[PDB]
Amino acid sequence: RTVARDITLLECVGKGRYGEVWRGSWQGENVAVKIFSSRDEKSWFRETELYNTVMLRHENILGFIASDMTSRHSSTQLWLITHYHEMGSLYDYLQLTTLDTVSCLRIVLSIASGLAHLHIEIFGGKPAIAHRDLKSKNILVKKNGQCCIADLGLAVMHRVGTKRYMAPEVLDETIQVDCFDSYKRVDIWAFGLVLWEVARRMVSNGIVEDYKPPFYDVVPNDPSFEDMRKVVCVDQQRPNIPNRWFSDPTLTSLAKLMKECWYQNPSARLTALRIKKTLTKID
Ligand SMILES: COc1cc(-c2cncc(-c3ccc(C4CCN(C)CC4)cc3)c2C)cc(OC)c1OC
Ligand SMILES: COc1cc(-c2cncc(-c3ccc(C4CCN(C)CC4)cc3)c2C)cc(OC)c1OC
Numbered sequence: 185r186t187v188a189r190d191i192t193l194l195e196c197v198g199k200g201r202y203g204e205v206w207r208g209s210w211q212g213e214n215v216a217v218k219i220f221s222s223r224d225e226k227s228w229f230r231e232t233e234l235y236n237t238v239m240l241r242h243e244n245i246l247g248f249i250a251s252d253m254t255s256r257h258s259s260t261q262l263w264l265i266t267h268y269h270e271m272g273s274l275y276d277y278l279q280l281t282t283l284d285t286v287s288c289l290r291i292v293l294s295i296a297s298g299l300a301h302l303h304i305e306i307f308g309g310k311p312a313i314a315h316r317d318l319k320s321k322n323i324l325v326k327k328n329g330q331c332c333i334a335d336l337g338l339a340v341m342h343r344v345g346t347k348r349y350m351a352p353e354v355l356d357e358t359i360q361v362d363c364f365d366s367y368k369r370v371d372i373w374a375f376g377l378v379l380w381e382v383a384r385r386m387v388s389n390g391i392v393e394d395y396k397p398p399f400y401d402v403v404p405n406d407p408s409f410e411d412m413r414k415v416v417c418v419d420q421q422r423p424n425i426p427n428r429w430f431s432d433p434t435l436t437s438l439a440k441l442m443k444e445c446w447y448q449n450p451s452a453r454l455t456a457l458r459i460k461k462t463l464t465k466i467d
């Protein structure tokens with residue numbers, strides 16, 4: 185039998201320190217091809233090891249297709265092939281797009297659903313998984329209005345995270361590194377930041393905030409570890425909740441939720457399953 189492995193690389197949709205992402209075509213179908221830099225080879229190994237352990241399949245997790253290693257003359261080429269989401273990342277999408285109540289809730293409940301699926305151990309199943317780099321650039325928007333979580337290159341089963349999204353216990357180095365639940369609680373902090381980014385773009389009473397990344401008003405464009413530690417740990421700042429949210433029942437409920445993801449005490453933060461339940465009772 186013929187094993188068709190040719191993928192036609194059609195357009196670069198992402199370039200960074202990680203390497204590149206391409207829209208590709210296999211057998212008439214769009215796929216996404218991440219070509220890893222030498223900088224980021226260990227992310228390919230980690231994600232490949234995870235998918236060799238558990239074949240995750242969930243509507244809110246970017247769908248795996250393949251891990252490919254090809255011998256070249258003087259290098260190894262590493263590709264991760266996934267489902268392709270033409271609308272791109274949530275970060276991208278929020279720059280131009282504003283949301284109504286239904287779309288806002290559908291986006292955030294879909295992210296919570298993906299995250300709870302990662303976090304939960306299923307017996308008989310999957311190991312519990314923490315993501316460790318959750319952020320709006322690592323979430324893709326699907327045409328049905330739900331999102332999916334991407335990039336398990338730092339994930340842990342039971343490279344550092346993006347500094348802007350690091351929880352206080354990561355920044356002050358008090359994280360309980362021998363406790364898997366510690367890593368779930370770091371993801372919940374990051375989830376609360378993403379929830380803030382999305383809620384800002386939800387229209388109420390003809391008002392919306394411009395897209396901004398978390399802590400845009402208190403750290404530099406490319407913040408240092410120290411910049412983040414001073415804001416989050418020493419001064420204990422949290423993202424601003426605009427007054428206009430408190431006129432809108434959905435944004436009032438989302439402000440409460442994001443506060444309960446941002447407690448200094450990691451064990452006080454809501455779990456992903458509790459966030460889902462709260463979101464199903466809003467509106
Ligand atoms: C190696 O490399 C790539 C392969 C493919 C690909 C292409 N045609 C067919 C296949 C296939 C799947 C499964 C079987 C089964 C059938 C019965 N079963 C009990 C034993 C084996 C056979 C063949 C694959 C996996 C795509 C690729 O890219 C999208 C590949 O490169 C990453
Ligand atoms: C990697 O990804 C893609 C792969 C394929 C693909 C191509 N040839 C054959 C297969 C296949 C056939 C049969 C079995 C099983 C059936 C039951 N039992 C007897 C064990 C064997 C497994 C696998 C597939 C899945 C198609 C795809 O898209 C249409 C893929 O997605 C891009």
Ligand SMILES: COc1cc(-c2cncc(-c3ccc(C4CCN(C)CC4)cc3)c2C)cc(OC)c1OC
Pocket residue numbers: 197198205207216217218264265266267268269270271272273276321322323324334335336
């Ligand atoms: C976060 O991480 C990964 C993401 C992806 C991925 C999957 N579907 C689609 C995309 C994409 C497509 C299109 C655009 C643009 C192009 C045109 N328009 C003007 C705006 C939109 C952006 C993004 C990506 C980047 C794949 C990955 O691995 C293969 C990723 O890494 C795990």
